[PDB]
């Protein structure tokens, strides 16, 4: 969870940032990134399903410029095919993504956008990453 209003200070929400760290000791355990990363980012993004906010400071701090670059490329087109498949004749996606999940009303795309989020975080090494440092 982190707030970043247009032209303002990054008002991050700590109070317990020692939980993303728990996912930091675990990226270690495995190889520089590797699928295993998803294993812990799975139970952390699948359990507390943080708002798109975290993705802002979780992808900009836990990852880095490059990774985020292609990590989303997966997503980019993933949505193109995720909705082609037949999610629901598409209804809320239409808007931006952070919008579908940052929506207490239409949360369906929050459990789905999370399933495609780790599919772009577990395919990182084999489709978008640099395990030569990661």
Curated annotation (Swiss-Prot):
User: What highest taxon heads this organism's lineage?
Assistant: Viruses
Name where it's found.
Virion
**Function, please?**
Forms the spherical core of the virus that encapsulates the genomic RNA-nucleocapsid complex.
Q: What's in the domain note?
A: The capsid protein N-terminus seems to be involved in Gag-Gag interactions.
- Give the protein's recorded name: Capsid protein p24
Q: Which organism is it from?
A: Human T-cell leukemia virus 1 (strain Japan MT-2 subtype A)
- Name the lineage: Viruses, Riboviria, Pararnavirae, Artverviricota, Revtraviricetes
Q: Which gene encodes it?
A: gag
Q: Which residues of the full protein are shown?
A: 131 to 264 of 429
